[PDB]
Amino acid sequence: VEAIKRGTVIDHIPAQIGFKLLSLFKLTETDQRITIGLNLPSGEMGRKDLIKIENTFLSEDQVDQLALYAPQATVNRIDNYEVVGKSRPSLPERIDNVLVCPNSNCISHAEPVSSSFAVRKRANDIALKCKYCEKEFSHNVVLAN
Amino acid sequence: VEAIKRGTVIDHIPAQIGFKLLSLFKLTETDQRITIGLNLPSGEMGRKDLIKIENTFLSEDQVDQLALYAPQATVNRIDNYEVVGKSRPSLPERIDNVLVCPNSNCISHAEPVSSSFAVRKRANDIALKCKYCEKEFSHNVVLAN
Amino acid sequence: ANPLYQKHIISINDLSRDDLNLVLATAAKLKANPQPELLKHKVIASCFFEASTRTRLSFETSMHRLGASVVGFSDSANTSLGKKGETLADTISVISTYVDAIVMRHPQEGAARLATEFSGNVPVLNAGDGSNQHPTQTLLDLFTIQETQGRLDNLHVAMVGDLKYGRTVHSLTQALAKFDGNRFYFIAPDALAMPQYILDMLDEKGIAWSLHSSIEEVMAEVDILYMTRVQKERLDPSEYANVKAQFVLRASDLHNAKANMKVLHPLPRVDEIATDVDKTPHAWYFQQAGNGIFARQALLALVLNRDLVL
Amino acid sequence: ANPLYQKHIISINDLSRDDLNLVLATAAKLKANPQPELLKHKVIASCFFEASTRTRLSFETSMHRLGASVVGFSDSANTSLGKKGETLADTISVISTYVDAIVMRHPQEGAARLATEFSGNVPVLNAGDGSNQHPTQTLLDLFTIQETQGRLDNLHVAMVGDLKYGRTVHSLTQALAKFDGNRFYFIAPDALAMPQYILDMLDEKGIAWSLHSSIEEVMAEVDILYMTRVQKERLDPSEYANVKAQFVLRASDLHNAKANMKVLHPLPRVDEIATDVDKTPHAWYFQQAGNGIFARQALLALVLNRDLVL
Amino acid sequence: ANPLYQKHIISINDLSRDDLNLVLATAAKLKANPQPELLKHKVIASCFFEASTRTRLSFETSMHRLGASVVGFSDSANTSLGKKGETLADTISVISTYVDAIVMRHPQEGAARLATEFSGNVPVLNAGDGSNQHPTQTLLDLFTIQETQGRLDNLHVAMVGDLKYGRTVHSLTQALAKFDGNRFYFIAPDALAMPQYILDMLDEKGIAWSLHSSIEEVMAEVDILYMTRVQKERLDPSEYANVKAQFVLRASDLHNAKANMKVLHPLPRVDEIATDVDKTPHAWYFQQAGNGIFARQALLALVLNRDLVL
Ligand SMILES: NC(=O)[C@H](CC(=O)O)NC(=O)CP(=O)(O)O
Ligand SMILES: NC(=O)[C@H](CC(=O)O)NC(=O)CP(=O)(O)O
Ligand SMILES: NC(=O)[C@H](CC(=O)O)NC(=O)CP(=O)(O)O
Ligand SMILES: [Zn+2]
Ligand SMILES: [Zn+2]
């Protein structure tokens, strides 16, 4: 058996992505119960990951932050053992804190400010334009600390 | 309670140590079904982390390399849905490759060699002696890579 | 309150064709009728953490020209940020409690943007932030382009030199792209090419641009030949092959030049523009530099004074 | 002639409770009603032989705020004292023939005192002389302490950091000791402890002070938590063990803090004050820095203008 | 083959009491009856990446006395590792194809240990690795103690100075602790105290030791007074308060010493030993250094010769 009483359940996470999400948004740094399922079967997606966090909720923006890694995912808001809300991540207009600007001469590396990038669906991929820099890179090359 | 045909189950992992184990052990690197439980209620340990990797087994010393992180953890080899082997991590003679000598002037930092320490339980903590600089440190100090 | 009152001037990307037009118009009015007391009782900071001759001096001259007082430094080496390990943020946090506006040039990209987040109600004016933006340069550039061409649209513009690190061409290309029908010719080594985020922006507006290996190639149809200096101080050693200017304009290259064509250069110049060019009718970089006065008086007037130039 | 007309401002030890009160009152009047022309026709020297951001800029802003002109330097490297081997004495001897007042900061203790012996009738204002005095800091500090506490007496004050080289705490401790009933808590490594000549002076007035090893210990009863930066540039290598701040105030240490308690810091800060403290209601070092304007306008007004602020 | 034939000599911690005695006995014999052709046809590398006078010169001299050839360097600045960025590993890999034995001194701890992992069948003799081990110093020290005291048992030994960074005392204490009944006295600053891993070793063997803040405190009981230099090259700036010697030995401090006590010092000495001690019957640092010759010849002979019958 497995069913949390109250919290959030991020389902349909791509493979090898669930762990990334865990260390990126450091979702494990909490006292709340967390059950994680990696490399699980799904069929409609082959195999997928699953993260469940009790007594923890995610605003729409927080859900959109997942868009970049798990686009076809589904965030289930759960309360009283029941799924009271179901939302899917949609491309956010910007990403903050999590990533690090690749431009070594950017003022963001030295000063006490949180990182921030504008998100742009360029074509084959997504382009990240630094709020400080004004230089834009492909999501692929823009690292995370 | 979950269930797996074959594999290993690390139980009684101190709270906030499970995720670390997944990390520096690249356990999520496999494509085998994995189940993680963080901050799970524990009868005598209060809270605990628990990991399950089906079709995977650990090293007799990696279980000891585990004795440093989760001294009171318990690895269970499982086959045909049964615990064919229950183990307990005991302090090994030495630890290789994973530790980083806290001494900044140790040659081990500049050259192409694997780290290596000699384990030795001291008064209250554990002492680690570098093979190269021959310096000794409290395992607490060494565990900060 | 004019559109630019109490407003930060950080990137041309944040400004609109109207904002730009407003500065030029104001510059024209003030050049025609100076207002010596327009900014009396104002104290403005001139903070240059990076070298400068025209930008800092024209800016300070303008402040005095409008009756304001100036405080600041032209070298961070003696500020507490330079000798006591202080953050730029705390530096702005304290200076913004003394002045009415902050003019700052900095070696790192985004310094000006950063400052706006710690200045409070004190407007930050970007005098150059690394190889990113140089908003007041574009303003004086536009003033000059119109003074000599009669318009800011339907022009053929060639930008030569280091287009990658040239904060000058970044702002100017974005500004000129807010006007209609402009043709862009980019003459620069492949290593110091115009950044993609500029080209994309151009493609976005269906603006016509093309790369060229020589000046001769476009000398016949350019209205403005914009020369630039290789930003050696910003180059990575793995790009040191480009330190020496590839394109050197000599007086003898100006034969196919149209009578209206003018050579501009944000300056300083190394050898990209021979001195024999100086006496020709096409040379206009010194006139351009002088226009820095009017543009900067204009911007200052618009940011610190509520009503339009009465 | 007000008590401070044409007077040197070198050490708090030379000032009396009345003098201090006179500056604060004047600062209050000028903050309420600025006098833009009060010092018109005055030329003041701003001579910084040592790094500075707040002190020099707030001082110059104040001079302009009162209508005076400024001349000087922020780096002795290009003065004749820096490149021709000139004495500080001769430097003052000549500058005192050009200006109405001299503001100077210097790396050696007693430089300001020294200057007064060669300036003639030109008043010298100490902007900091080594690890000795910092009179104008105490003035702005006192203005801030009263603005946030409603009084300058019967307060519990904790001074943290490098109390030995902190010219800031030397002047301030002496100033606060001219008022009655103040309790002093000194939190500092034994190597950078408050000098004996300060403690003796305290014992002299039966003032209560005690040493403490942590902030937590006194966080419950302090009205003002005065944080300081380790004066690394003044440390001897045999004291380099203390370069790194021992006491770091984080937002989570402010729970036992009284509602009135305010954290002050002459600035700049390294890591002795986390940035999470910045947004709390107790943080007041930037407000403090801004008060440098009023205090310095006040002092200037009192020293260069004969009548009280009319 | 003898016990030490073809053996690496990295740390006293890898040697037994017997190994030491073997070296000492061979040293005594070589001192009495020289063997100029013992190491004929051998080529040894003397590689010093850290400064040295006694250790390198005595070693090379010992090689020549035994008839071997010497190749090497006293500075890494002109080796490929110093100019072309080669690893120590690679360096040892190629030098080990040229010579019969490698004598090396390095700034990093563990450098000698690492070498053994790249030298193949080539023995490595650690001439000093950072502040870790100094095996040949101990060998000569033990040789010197032995002949001046006729024993290596039941001695009263005092070590003074920098015990933390002294690779000399780290190796000497371990070795003496392999003998019975020795008592130790450590006289050193709190910050440069004898490492704990050494102390735990002494407790493990039930060997008496104790701390003292003065030499006078033990002068009357010691047989060996081992003085050391403050290893400023190894100090962290947060320990720069210890550069100057805390204990200075003067002829006058020897008034109540045992008649047989010898003052030893690995050398160089800065000021911890005044020159007036040089003329007393206790001064034995030079005789000590001179014994470096016999001890190192002994080591070179045992390692490079299967059998020695002298
Ligand atoms: N980006 C700049 O500073 C441009 C171009 C260049 O430096 O080559 N130059 C100026 O603004 C003139 P300044 O550095 O004398 O103030
Ligand atoms: N003594 C000072 O200069 C104090 C404290 C310090 O420097 O840490 N600071 C100031 O006066 C600010 P400033 O050096 O930016 O003018
Ligand atoms: N560890 C050493 O090098 C010891 C102790 C010291 O340097 O103070 N001295 C020596 O080995 C003498 P050397 O540096 O002249 O070869
Ligand atoms: Zn950036
Ligand atoms: Zn080590």
JSON list of C-alpha atoms in Angstrom, two decimals, chain A residues 103-108 110-113 120 122 129 131-136, chain C residues 11 13 87-89 106-110 113-114 117 131-133 196-197 200:
[
{"chain": "A", "resi": 103, "resn": "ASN", "atom": "CA", "xyz": [29.27, 34.22, -18.06]},
{"chain": "A", "resi": 104, "resn": "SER", "atom": "CA", "xyz": [32.30, 34.32, -15.75]},
{"chain": "A", "resi": 105, "resn": "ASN", "atom": "CA", "xyz": [32.36, 38.14, -15.80]},
{"chain": "A", "resi": 106, "resn": "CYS", "atom": "CA", "xyz": [28.75, 38.41, -14.59]},
{"chain": "A", "resi": 107, "resn": "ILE", "atom": "CA", "xyz": [28.25, 40.52, -11.47]},
{"chain": "A", "resi": 108, "resn": "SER", "atom": "CA", "xyz": [25.98, 37.77, -10.06]},
{"chain": "A", "resi": 110, "resn": "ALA", "atom": "CA", "xyz": [30.47, 38.00, -6.76]},
{"chain": "A", "resi": 111, "resn": "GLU", "atom": "CA", "xyz": [27.52, 39.85, -5.26]},
{"chain": "A", "resi": 112, "resn": "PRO", "atom": "CA", "xyz": [24.79, 38.84, -2.77]},
{"chain": "A", "resi": 113, "resn": "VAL", "atom": "CA", "xyz": [21.98, 38.34, -5.29]},
{"chain": "A", "resi": 120, "resn": "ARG", "atom": "CA", "xyz": [12.49, 31.81, -24.01]},
{"chain": "A", "resi": 122, "resn": "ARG", "atom": "CA", "xyz": [13.77, 29.65, -29.02]},
{"chain": "A", "resi": 129, "resn": "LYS", "atom": "CA", "xyz": [18.77, 35.31, -20.77]},
{"chain": "A", "resi": 131, "resn": "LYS", "atom": "CA", "xyz": [18.67, 39.36, -15.73]},
{"chain": "A", "resi": 132, "resn": "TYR", "atom": "CA", "xyz": [22.04, 40.88, -14.84]},
{"chain": "A", "resi": 133, "resn": "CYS", "atom": "CA", "xyz": [24.08, 39.83, -17.91]},
{"chain": "A", "resi": 134, "resn": "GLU", "atom": "CA", "xyz": [21.61, 40.29, -20.73]},
{"chain": "A", "resi": 135, "resn": "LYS", "atom": "CA", "xyz": [23.60, 37.50, -22.41]},
{"chain": "A", "resi": 136, "resn": "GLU", "atom": "CA", "xyz": [21.53, 34.45, -23.31]},
{"chain": "C", "resi": 11, "resn": "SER", "atom": "CA", "xyz": [19.70, 48.82, -21.00]},
{"chain": "C", "resi": 13, "resn": "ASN", "atom": "CA", "xyz": [16.43, 46.73, -24.36]},
{"chain": "C", "resi": 87, "resn": "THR", "atom": "CA", "xyz": [30.31, 44.48, -1.77]},
{"chain": "C", "resi": 88, "resn": "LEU", "atom": "CA", "xyz": [29.05, 46.67, -4.61]},
{"chain": "C", "resi": 89, "resn": "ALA", "atom": "CA", "xyz": [25.60, 46.25, -3.11]},
{"chain": "C", "resi": 106, "resn": "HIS", "atom": "CA", "xyz": [31.74, 48.97, -13.99]},
{"chain": "C", "resi": 107, "resn": "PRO", "atom": "CA", "xyz": [33.95, 46.14, -15.30]},
{"chain": "C", "resi": 108, "resn": "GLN", "atom": "CA", "xyz": [31.34, 43.40, -14.71]},
{"chain": "C", "resi": 109, "resn": "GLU", "atom": "CA", "xyz": [28.24, 42.93, -16.86]},
{"chain": "C", "resi": 110, "resn": "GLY", "atom": "CA", "xyz": [25.02, 43.72, -14.98]},
{"chain": "C", "resi": 113, "resn": "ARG", "atom": "CA", "xyz": [21.16, 46.41, -12.99]},
{"chain": "C", "resi": 114, "resn": "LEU", "atom": "CA", "xyz": [22.50, 45.15, -9.66]},
{"chain": "C", "resi": 117, "resn": "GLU", "atom": "CA", "xyz": [18.15, 46.75, -6.58]},
{"chain": "C", "resi": 131, "resn": "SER", "atom": "CA", "xyz": [30.80, 44.23, -22.49]},
{"chain": "C", "resi": 132, "resn": "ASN", "atom": "CA", "xyz": [27.03, 44.48, -22.11]},
{"chain": "C", "resi": 133, "resn": "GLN", "atom": "CA", "xyz": [25.25, 47.83, -22.41]},
{"chain": "C", "resi": 196, "resn": "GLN", "atom": "CA", "xyz": [23.31, 35.86, -31.36]},
{"chain": "C", "resi": 197, "resn": "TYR", "atom": "CA", "xyz": [20.81, 37.59, -29.05]},
{"chain": "C", "resi": 200, "resn": "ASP", "atom": "CA", "xyz": [17.82, 36.89, -33.31]}
]
